Amino acid sequence: KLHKEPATLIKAIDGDTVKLMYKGQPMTFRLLLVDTPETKHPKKGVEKYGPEAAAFTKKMVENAKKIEVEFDKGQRTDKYGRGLAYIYADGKMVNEALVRQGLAKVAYVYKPNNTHEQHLRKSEAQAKKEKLNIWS
Template sequence: MRLKLIPALLAASLLTGCGSDHAERPQVPASGQAPASSYGADKNSAPPVSGKGYETDQLDIAKAPVQLVRAVDGDTIRVEWQGQEENVRFLLIDTPETSHPQLGVQPYGPEAKDFTARMVEEADLLELEFDIGPNRDKYGRLLAYVYADGVMVQEALLHEGLARVAYIYPPNVRYVDKFNGLQQDSRNEAQGIWSVENYAQEDGFYPEHFDDTAAAEAEEPASKATPAEDKTPANGCSIKGNINSKGDKIYHTPESRYYDATDPEAWFCSEQEAEAAGFRAPKS
């Protein structure tokens, strides 16, 4: 079974021979595990398309078929093209890294790579479309829009929240308006990279925001108290003991960040008493 073709995703393709084969383009550096994408799990489903209409939906440009060698990353594949093996960098998008020498593995990088690999490896027909400007970057990689059985991989990645719009260098901007629209939809729905505030930014990815959010969630109590439930015992003890969703025993003093939200499973009169019972102080 293969991914169904979507009319709005079949709109665009390739202007062969456009641009210099050796023109350089400036590059902007991008700077845990996360939930896997739902798209691709069912190979009979294709990504929904935004109801917005774009002028580029009406284009009818011939695409160039290529043979896949392998998926390199979420935004890069290796193909056989014109008798040679070439790396293809996806135009106008950026996905988190999986093997960068300095940045290492970034959150949602493995998901983006797996997503792209699933699309291109399962496709009967893999095609490239160049834009009207240079078709190579300064590293010699081809710059193209990539289609797997007629579905543009860039659009699918943006729809799933596994890529951000990036590297916008005119005149290679044919689909930038549509890409921005798809990105905004994913952002509004907090999909993928947009599920953690400030992780994906205009100049790259910032895992420290991802780590801060994950740490805060780990410290948040598993149960929340309502004012009616939250009654201090008659003995005056005010330290709340709670067991969170991960099974961690954490105590909260009245100064703790989550004190008011905590539904206590135990009360303690001192921090020493809480620690003796196996509870620890929160990390934040």
């Protein structure tokens, strides 16, 4: 069973990345299963809807009382050292909130880190139907 653990915000970095204090250590976290347009893209730079996704993530974590992280059942870090997790702001998953708003797509999935995949894909289908942001 997945479990939520507490964490403390340090800094929001981009739509898809936040730095948190986790078990008393600063760590960078990549949000599992979503791809946001980025402000810090390796090659493109500032993509379309990137500032918007970045502001949404930032506001959501900065205004939270409680941040929780939930790892999935497979690897917990990626090749850059970033934690791979679902992030919750007052009980609300940030990963899902971004997809539901049309500010992220469901990413290419890699088993077994796929526990909330069907849920996110359902939110994404709804955002596409509503033609929100990325889908407008």
